[PDB]
Design an enzyme around this catalytic site. Structure first.
Site, short mmCIF file in Angstrom:
data_model
loop_
_atom_site.label_atom_id
_atom_site.label_comp_id
_atom_site.label_asym_id
_atom_site.label_seq_id
_atom_site.Cartn_x
_atom_site.Cartn_y
_atom_site.Cartn_z
N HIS A 87 0.79 -1.23 0.00
CA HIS A 87 0.00 0.00 0.00
C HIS A 87 0.83 1.28 0.00
O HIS A 87 0.27 2.37 0.10
CB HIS A 87 -1.01 0.02 1.15
CG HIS A 87 -0.43 0.41 2.48
ND1 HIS A 87 -0.45 -0.44 3.57
CD2 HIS A 87 0.15 1.56 2.90
CE1 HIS A 87 0.10 0.17 4.61
NE2 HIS A 87 0.48 1.38 4.23
N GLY A 145 3.26 6.29 9.87
CA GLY A 145 4.50 6.08 9.14
C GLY A 145 5.34 4.92 9.64
O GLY A 145 6.46 4.70 9.17
N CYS A 196 4.56 1.86 9.27
CA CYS A 196 4.30 0.73 8.34
C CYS A 196 5.57 0.27 7.71
O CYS A 196 6.39 1.12 7.27
CB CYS A 196 3.32 1.18 7.27
SG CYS A 196 1.70 1.22 7.99
#
Lengths: 4, 306, 301, 4
Positions: free
Chosen positions: C41, C143, C145
Site C-alpha cells: 500500500h 508512518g 508501516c
C-alpha cells in the site's frame, strides 16, 4: 551480596 | 497510537560487547576503540570475592592471563589497569564498530536501556530506571556482569551503567563507566542491602502528561495545589518529594498541554486519595513511574536514531 | 533474578531497514540481499485507500517510480512484483549486513520483538504478543508501516511480522513476511474492527511460574483442580480454554518449581475469583499474559 | 482503518  | 515502554535500538551497543575471562571467571566487557572495560571483580574466584585486595590481586595478573573474546576472535591484550571498580584492558585492535559515544553518570529516577549479555553475547534488551534508592529492578542471571545501560541521542551512545551485582532483595547495583558505584554499594560479597525505595513522582507526572497527550484526560480537574500540600499527600503514599527543580523539568510538557504542573499535581493527588475507581490510564491500572519527561517527548514525537 | 518484558537485541534487524517512497507516500522496507519488502500500500494514495485495486495500481508503476533509500543513499530498483499484500522490489546491490534469517508465520499467543521505525530509521524496540484475535497492542505512529516483528534463535532472525495498519480501537494489524494478513483484515480503509479478545491462559500460568521461581509464592494454595473445572471457571473471566497440550508445555516449569500444573491452575482459579487483594505479583497488580512458557525459561533459566 |  552476589557478584554477577 | 498505543504507548509502550521502549528500549533504544541496541545495534550500536551490540557491536561493543565482548567476553572477558580470568581463569574460572567469565563475564562481559565493553569494547570501545582499543580498550575493553569490565568489572574488576573478574580477577576473582569463589572465596576471593568476600574481601579481596584488588590493588594487590591485580599486581600478580599479567596481560596474557586475560582472555578477551570478540566473536570467534581472541583480542590480544597489551595493557591493563584499574579505574575505580573497573578494569581497563588495552587491546591491539581498535573496535571497528565503535559508535560515537560518551560516558555519563545519570541521576536517580532517570531511565536507560539494558543490553543483557552472557559470554559476550547479547540475550535481550529492556528499559528500566535508576531507583531513588540507587538500585535497578533489572533482570540478571549469572554471567551478566559487565552488561551495560545506555541512552542514544542521534548517533551518540551515552553509556551510563555497567552491571556488577545483585543484592539480597533480588535487585541490582553497578557503576558508571568510570567504575564509581551508584549508591553506597561496594564490589565485595558482604551484607549490604538496598535502602527503602520510593515512587518517582517526576516520572508519574510525565506519564500523566503522556496520557493527556494521547487524549486520555478523564483524571484532570478544575483545581490546583501548593507544592507543599502535594508533598504532604505524596509522601503519605511513599512518593519522592517533588521539588521546584522537578516542576521546571516538566515545563516543556506543561507547555505542550497547557496544563500547569501544580494543576496536574492536584489531579495526581486525587488519583492517590481515591484510586482510579474503575478506569485506566494509557490502558494501565497503575501509575507508571519509569517514563521520564524526556522519554515522553522522544516517543510522542517519533524521534529516531541514525 | 528480577523479571522484565524483554526484547531481542535488534541490531541484526537494524542493518536491514530501508525507506521506500512511491510518490508522496513514504514507509519502511526490509532489505535482505538484493530484495526489499514493504507493504504493497505504499503505492496507494489515501484516496485509493477506500477501495484499492492493487493489480490496477501496480501495473501502472515503473521500477523507477519506487524511491528506495538506505539512509541518505538511493538503491536503484531494477525489479518489482507483488506477493499477497507485500511489495518485493529487486535492487541492484546486496545488503552486506543481511543476517542469517527465515520467514515464519507465528501462532496467536506467541511473542516477538518489534523494531519500530520511521523513514527507515530505528526508533525503539519492544516486546509484545500476538493477541488471540490477531491484533497487536502496539505503539505505532503514522508512518511506522514496514516496521517488522522478529525473534532470534541463535544468530538466525525469524521474521514473523510486518506492520500495515491501525484499527479503530487503536490496535494494529499486519502480515507475515509472505504478505498474508494475520486475522481477517485487509489493506483498505473500511470499518473492520478487532474481534473479541481473550486472555492468554498459557502465558498467565507461565508468568505465575516466573513469580514463583522468583520467591513470590503468596498466591499458591493447598487445592488442586481438573482441567475441566479450571476451564469452567476461567471461561467466565474471559480466558482462553486451556488444553492438555498447554499443560504439557508447562512441564519443565512444573518440574523446576515442583508445583504441579493443575495446582498452579487452582491458584489461578482463586486469583480470578478473589482478585489480588491489593497484593502484587512480580510487581504487577494484574495477571500478565505476554510471556510464553519459553520466554519464562529463557529469562529465568 | 488507517493504513499506517
Amino acid at each position: 551480596a552476589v557478584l554477577x | 497510537s498505543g504507548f509502550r515502554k521502549m528500549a533504544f535500538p541496541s545495534g550500536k551497543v551490540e557491536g561493543c560487547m565482548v567476553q572477558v575471562t580470568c581463569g574460572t571467571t567469565t563475564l562481559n566487557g565493553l569494547w570501545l576503540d582499543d580498550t575493553v572495560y569490565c568489572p574488576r571483580h573478574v580477577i576473582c574466584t569463589a572465596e576471593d570475592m568476600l574481601n579481596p585486595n584488588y590493588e594487590d590481586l591485580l599486581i600478580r595478573k599479567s596481560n596474557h592471563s586475560f582472555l578477551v573474546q570478540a566473536g570467534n576472535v581472541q583480542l590480544r591484550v597489551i595493557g591493563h589497569s584499574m579505574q575505580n571498580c573497573l578494569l581497563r584492558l588495552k587491546v591491539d585492535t581498535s573496535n571497528p564498530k565503535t559508535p560515537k559515544y560518551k560516558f555519563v553518570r545519570i541521576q536517580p529516577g532517570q531511565t536507560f536501556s539494558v543490553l543483557a549479555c552472557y559470554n559476550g553475547s547479547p540475550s535481550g534488551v529492556y528499559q528500566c530506571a535508576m531507583r531513588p534508592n540507587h538500585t535497578i529492578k533489572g533482570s540478571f542471571l549469572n554471567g551478566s556482569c559487565g552488561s551495560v545501560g545506555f541512552n542514544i541521542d542521534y548517533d551518540c551512545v551515552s553509556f551510563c551503567y555497567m552491571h556488577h551485582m545483585e543484592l539480597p532483595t533480588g535487585v541490582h547495583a553497578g557503576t558508571d563507566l568510570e567504575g564509581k558505584f551508584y549508591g553506597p554499594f561496594v564490589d565485595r560479597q558482604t551484607a549490604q542491602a538496598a535502602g527503602t525505595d520510593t515512587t518517582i513522582t517526576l516520572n508519574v507526572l510525565a506519564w500523566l502528561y503522556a496520557a493527556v497527550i494521547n487524549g486520555d484526560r478523564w483524571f484532570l480537574n478544575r483545581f490546583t495545589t501548593t507544592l507543599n500540600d502535594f508533598n504532604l499527600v505524596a509522601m503519605k503514599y511513599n512518593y519522592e518529594p517533588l521539588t521546584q527543580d522537578h516542576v521546571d523539568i516538566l515545563g516543556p510538557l506543561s507547555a505542550q498541554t497547557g496544563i500547569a504542573v501544580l494543576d496536574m499535581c492536584a489531579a495526581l493527588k486525587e488519583l492517590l486519595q481515591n484510586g482510579m475507581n474503575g478506569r485506566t490510564i494509557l490502558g494501565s491500572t497503575i501509575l507508571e513511574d519509569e517514563f521520564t519527561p524526556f522519554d515522553v517527548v522522544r516517543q510522542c514525537s517519533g524521534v529516531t536514531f541514525q
